[PDB]
Write a protein that binds this ligand. Sequence first.
Ligand SMILES: COCC(=O)N[C@@H](Cc1ccc(-c2cc(Cl)cc(Cl)c2)cc1)[C@H](O)[C@@H](O)C(=O)O
Length: 164
Amino acid sequence: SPSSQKALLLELKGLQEEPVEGFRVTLVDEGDLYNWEVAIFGPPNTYYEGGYFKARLKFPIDYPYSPPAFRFLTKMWHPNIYETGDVCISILERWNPTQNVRTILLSVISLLNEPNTFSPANVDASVMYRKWKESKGKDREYTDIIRKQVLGTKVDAERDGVKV
Ligand SMILES: COCC(=O)N[C@@H](Cc1ccc(-c2cc(Cl)cc(Cl)c2)cc1)[C@H](O)[C@@H](O)C(=O)O
């Protein structure tokens, strides 16, 4: 039996018993231990509030000696998230056999809340964000886009029977 199996079943249980705030973790519908659904809710008092965003963790067979891959399925406009959904996360500071899903999920919240415009993944989002912060949020173009995606997700919430 793969060492990964037991490490993932334990990590799944830990996260369903003590969730990271805003995240809800399950397997995909076919029950593949190695492919997790991640449901992410925008927190109150942010432009993401009321959001329902979906992402995926794909784990290798040798986890935790190699890192999972993380990808948004929801389209997202952010200096650090690619067109594809892939994400800008160093720890994927670098990966260790002692890092774990809980740390990955917190480093997503950290990428979310504080964009790095130094090495952007989405260069137009990145320059549009610097301009937004420059204006001390007086300029509405970046938050217009986020607001639209957030409202869009209410369709996904409804298709999935969630629960915002
Ligand atoms: C442009 O929109 C930017 C935005 O709303 N930023 C927020 C940071 C922030 C906080 C939380 C998240 C966040 C957290 C989780 Cl757990 C899920 C999601 Cl979808 C977003 C992202 C950014 C705020 O500026 C921040 O100061 C606050 O109100 O806490």
